[PDB]
Amino acid sequence: IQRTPKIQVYSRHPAENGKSNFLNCYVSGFHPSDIEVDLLKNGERIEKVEHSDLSFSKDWSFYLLYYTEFTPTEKDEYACRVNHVTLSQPKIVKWDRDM
Amino acid sequence: KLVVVAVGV
Amino acid sequence: GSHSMRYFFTSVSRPGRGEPRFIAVGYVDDTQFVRFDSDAASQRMEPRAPWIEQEGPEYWDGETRKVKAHSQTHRVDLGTLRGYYNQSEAGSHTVQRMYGCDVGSDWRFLRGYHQYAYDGKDYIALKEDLRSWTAADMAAQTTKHKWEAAHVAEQLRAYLEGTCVEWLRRYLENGKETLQRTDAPKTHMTHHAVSDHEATLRCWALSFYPAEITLTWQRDGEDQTQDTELVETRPAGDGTFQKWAAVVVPSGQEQRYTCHVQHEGLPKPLTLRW
Ligand code: NA
Ligand code: NA
Ligand code: NA
Ligand code: NA
Ligand code: NA
Ligand code: NA
Incomplete structure (x- = not known):
């Protein structure tokens, strides 16, 4: 039983340039639990990234929240990069600030 | 509070 | 409850x-x-x-x-x-x-x-x-x-x-x-032109607890599922939850559409209208 992750990339608070916030990558609906999740700033892996403790849904599929403090700007691009046994290549999801 | 014993499958 | x-x-x-x-x-x-x-x-x-x-x-x-x-x-x-x-x-x-x-x-x-x-x-x-x-x-x-x-x-x-x-x-x-x-959802609506003729209305529910919530769109007071999108409820990271629902509508007809929010923290369900 191999289920591919669903990915949402979003901020904790409505994004305003120059105002401290949290960047979230929520990965859900996956099995097995072994997964690689990085938050990217302009294509570069962010070092200070924490995640929730592994838990799971009624269908036994896993979910994790990965997050970091960040200050959004006009120019800087943020994304979530996810690798899992169900993916032929790492999946990159760009942060859209009304998603 | 957790259950005290977990019997094997 | x-x-x-x-x-x-x-x-x-x-x-x-x-x-x-x-x-x-x-x-x-x-x-x-x-x-x-x-x-x-x-x-x-x-x-x-x-x-x-x-x-x-x-x-x-x-x-x-x-x-x-x-x-x-x-x-x-x-x-x-x-x-x-x-x-x-x-x-x-x-x-x-x-x-x-x-x-x-x-x-x-x-x-x-x-x-x-x-x-x-x-x-x-x-x-x-x-x-x-x-x-x-x-x-x-x-x-x-x-x-x-x-x-x-x-x-x-x-x-x-x-x-x-x-x-x-x-x-x-x-x-x-x-x-x-209970933390009742903080609700608002955003408006995004997708063409000269069409707009996306997005109904937001933010900072709510517990996670259980229902977002529904109505057109002229009847439930609409066609041309809608509903994201999985997601954690904010501060112990609260977020969700949104969107509908694509003809530009100029936004007032026909209502977003209905049901949550334990709402005495009566909320209705949002652009
Ligand atoms: Na780990
Ligand atoms: Na330990
Ligand atoms: Na421990
Ligand atoms: Na299992
Ligand atoms: Na028994
Ligand atoms: Na009792």
Whole structure:
């Protein structure tokens, strides 16, 4: 039983340039639990990234929240990069600030 | 509070 | 309304070297309050909510002893299940367990549950009567015979109707400032032109607790599902939740559409209109 992750990339608070916030990558609906999740700033892996403790849904599929403090700007691009046994290549999801 | 014993499958 | 205490356990075998990865999480409703991770430094049950930090050393020693005992049972189970399914020692496998109890609106025992999975599929589950088992396949039927002979359901029934609900009620009182507070969704609507002729209306529900919520679109007071999108409820990271629903509408006809928000923290459902 191999289920591919669903990915949402979003901020904790409505994004305003120059105002401290949290960047979230929520990965859900996956099995097995072994997964690689990085938050990217302009294509570069962010070092200070924490995640929730592994838990799971009624269908036994896993979910994790990965997050970091960040200050959004006009120019800087943020994304979530996810690798899992169900993916032929790492999946990159760009942060859209009304998603 | 957790259950005290977990019997094997 | 109802309240729940639930514990979630995951064990993943590591055939290359060493013992399984084991992660245990405890929740009251949608609030994590304890964790154990075999990979963490403490090798202790750890607090994850301020209201459990109240509990003294006997509590933390007791929960650490039990969660380590759970981890050893899961380690043995990964071996037993490899045997039952005639699988090689080379592959990684997963066991998952979830158990817990609900109290109702009357604050009395409502229901108990204990569910077990192997490689992400149902294995064995305690039925609602707490007296019988659902075994998915003949491996699980072997476990069911063993657990019938060992009176495991009687053991779990005593915990689920006793200790489980008593400690749930204790936690709900100790943590009442947050656990018995509802956070109604903060709602607003955004408008995004998709063409010269069409717009997306997005209905936002932010900073709500608990996670259970319903967002529905109506057009002229009738539910609409065509040309809608609903995202999975997601954690904000501060203990609250977020959700949105969107509909594509003809530009100039936005006023026909209403977003309806249902949540425990709303005396009456909210209606939003552009
Ligand atoms: Na721990
Ligand atoms: Na890890
Ligand atoms: Na630990
Ligand atoms: Na009772
Ligand atoms: Na499993
Ligand atoms: Na039994």
